[model samples]
Each structure stands twice: as C-alpha cells, then as structure tokens.
Target: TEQGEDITSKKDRGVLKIVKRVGNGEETPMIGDKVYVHYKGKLSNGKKFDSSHDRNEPFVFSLGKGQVIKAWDIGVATMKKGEIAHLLIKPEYAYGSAGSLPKIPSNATLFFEIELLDFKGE
Candidate 1:
C-alpha cells in the first residue's frame, strides 16, 4: 500500500484530501480556469456510482464554480496539473441528505479518486 500526505481543508468542512501522486508543476489552477480531470466516485459502502474513465472522457469545469458539488469545487482547486489524489467528502460538503436520484443515497458520504490532467485560463 502507498502512503499519502493529508491536505487540510481551508474551510474546515471536514473534506479530506489525500495526495496519491504529486504533480510535476507547482502552479495551481485559478478560480476561472477550465480544469480537466479524470475521476471515479463511490459511496462509503464501496459501490461505484460514476467514473469519467469509463466513458474515456475527462470531466471539464471551471475552478471554484458550483457546476459540481461543494467538495469538488474545494478539492479540485487545490490540485496542481498532473496531480492524483483522493477526496473524502462529508455530506455537508457533498450531496447532503438529498442525494442524486438513483445511485447516491441520502446523507451519504462519498469517496472520489481524482486526477488533474490539466487546466487552461483565458
């Protein structure tokens, strides 16, 4: 098993980031940059719910935007290009009591394995 360094959440939302692989670059993405990432999401029960890799397409979104969940906006922004990490998201920072329809459950805790491929800003 590989050991990882823990990255504390600035907001103390109980979101935990464990760095699996550090990126080569030191620069992080800005709030408005377009971020490209490959991710797989699962419930605390270890059931797979979603994965960008399955589709062979990375997910793209603007950093710090609400296009995704609060955990994502907070977690992904802390990544550097080519970084690989895992995020443990509490319900408060995730779907909360009202989870996404069929797959995710209410008040569910989530785990995400994420890889920051790249980012671009205008």
Candidate 2:
C-alpha cells in the first residue's frame, strides 16, 4: 500500500522519495483522523527549521483539517502507517508566498523527512 499515491490537490502534492513502508492494514487516514508522525522540517538549503524528533515526541494533528501547512495535509494522508520518506514541496504547497513563522522566507520551497508512526480515528 506504500508505493505512493500522487495526493493531487490544488498543489498536486509533491514528489516523494520512499525510505520504507511498513503497513498493509488497508487503513489510510482521512479527514478527522488523528495522525501521529515524527518529522524534521528544513529549508531547501539544508537549514532545519523544526522537528518533532527534537521535542522527544511525535507531532500530532488531524488530517485534512486546517491549521497546518498545505503540503503536509496532502502528503501525510497518503502514507501507510510506519512509512518513511522524503517529501519535496514547492512553496505553493508549503507556506506559499507569505512564508511562515519567520524562519522560511517568502516563496521558499521546503523539504521534510517524515515518518508515519500511527493514526487513530476521531
């Protein structure tokens, strides 16, 4: 179940480089599902801006729900539990021209090494 899906949307998601895929459980997260992941976010230039790993805890969010970036909503929903990969996202799918949190500049692309730890239904 992890070969990958395009996750096409307004931004068409992004190209993914697979690292590993660990589940065939037939369950893919959808809107209102709680997703748990470990991820490291970086600028295209290799400067890390944030990481769930650094906090010694997984990052938890509701899939397809607002309040996160566009890229993440599209990308992570395609993941099978226990999958790992690198995601390349254009600024349009990321923070967009407005940038975000001050660390990423306006219209900058982003990179993230992400792993889907698990997910639960709302």
Candidate 3:
C-alpha cells in the first residue's frame, strides 16, 4: 500500500489558463530562448517547498539545453515573450517520482508561476 495517495482529483492549479493556442507547432524548447519565470513549489497542502521569488531572482533558462525540467522544455516552448503563466506539473513532467530533495514527494504535483521573459532566434 502507498503511504500517500496521488492528488489528481482537482482542477488545474495554474493561476492562468491558455485561452487559445495560435499554433500547433512542436512543443519543444530550443536553445537561446530567454525564459523569465517566477515559480513557487508547494506540497499538496499548500505549504511552500521552494520559491524563486523568495530569492528575488526570476529563473532564466536557455531552453532545449537541458537546463531545467522536461515540463519546462515542453511548456515554455508554447509561450510568447512577456507572457505570464502558471503551470501545474505532474510528477511525470516534474521530477518523475524521484522528486527534489527535502520537500517534493514521489508522484507529487507541483505549481509554478512562469513568465516568458524573452526568446531568441525569432
């Protein structure tokens, strides 16, 4: 038996939802795409696990170079510059059951506040 159950019974926890997607292009991040992100990682009960804003540094990652989680590689690809979004990532898209240390549990869900700061290569 599992110690804790999966929490997939709720609506999307993202702060914003995509009203419409303009294109069906590949959902993969490419190199040199400047990604500005504000993220707060929390547990099932809403206790903060980790937060980038708390450090006062919005995360900037170059896509497709393996600098971040796989979900980011897929999620941020669809975003436009200066766009703000929220992501509710499953463990499959997040840490994949291994999870991050000291906070994230196996198969847990994560919430993120993301902003597309900029993108290069047009």
Candidate 4:
C-alpha cells in the first residue's frame, strides 16, 4: 500500500484490512445501497487530518460506487450499521500516485476510523 507495512491482519474485501469492528455483524450495509457515516482519517503516524465528525456531519454515499475512494467502496460494503472499524487503505486502493483530496500526499496510505451510522436504498 503505502511505504509502511499494514497494521492489521484481517482484510475486508481483500484490498483493505479491518482493524476493529464494533457492534454485531448483522445489519450490514450492502452494495449499491446508501450509507451514512462519520469518520476520522489519519496517517500511519496518528496525525489528525480529516473528520466528518469534526464537521458535525455525517458523510453519505452509495456503497460500492466508484465515486468514492476505491478502498472505501470495497471495504465499507461489508460494514454493518452501528459498526465502527479502522480501515488500512493501501495506496492503490486509495488515490494511487495522484492522491484523492487536498492536504493528503501522493501515494499515502490512509487509516480511517469509520462508523456506520445508517444506510438505506434499493
């Protein structure tokens, strides 16, 4: 993924690892559904970078869509409602050489504290 090694042993969708899974495994969000979440993103060094919670908002997106970052699309599809997990997203599954957003560097692996608040859709 990034320059550093992966911190977790278990993978979600084979691209990103799930470090922590909160709540029961039931009520999970599936592909093509919409999910609402709050998150805090960090680098390997634990430096605070981004958070939906900091914005006092929940980020909503359609699961499994290419519109979001790649790893999140694959990984969060396995997440259950009321679930919280740390996702180790590799560079290829993330922004690759270009990076996804502002402030994050190219080829940076992202660690995300993800909480699945709710989801609904066809």
- Best-fitting candidate, scored by TM-score: 1
Better of 1 and 3 by TM-score: 1
**lDDT (Cα) of model 4:** 0.72
lDDT of 2: 0.76
| True-structure Cα RMSD, model 4 | 4.5
Q: Global lDDT for candidate 1?
A: 0.84
Q: Write the per-residue lDDT of candidate 2 for residues 24-113, one digit (tens) a residue.
A: 566778888999999988898866578886789999999998758877887787788878877777777777778866698888878787
Q: Which candidate achieves the best lDDT against the true structure?
A: 1
Q: Give the per-residue lDDT digits (tens) of candidate 4, residues 1-122.
A: 33222333353332554546566557777788988989888865665488997779899998877878877876677677888877777677777888756666778767887888889985
Q: Which parts of model 1 are misplaced by more than 4 Å?
A: 1-13
What are the models' TM-scores? 0.88, 0.82, 0.65, 0.78
Task: Please write out the lDDT profile of model 1 over residues 83-121, one tens digit for every residue.
Answer: 998888878888888988688889888889999999999
Better of 1 and 2 by TM-score: 1
Better-scoring candidate (lDDT), 1 or 3:
1
Per-candidate total of colliding backbone pairs: 0, 0, 0, 1
The ten-residue window of minimal lDDT in model 3 covers 1-10
Candidate 3 per-residue lDDT, tens place, 22-120, comes to: 333334346666666666667645765677877998787787667887667766765665665556666776776687766777777666656665555
Clashing pairs in 1: none
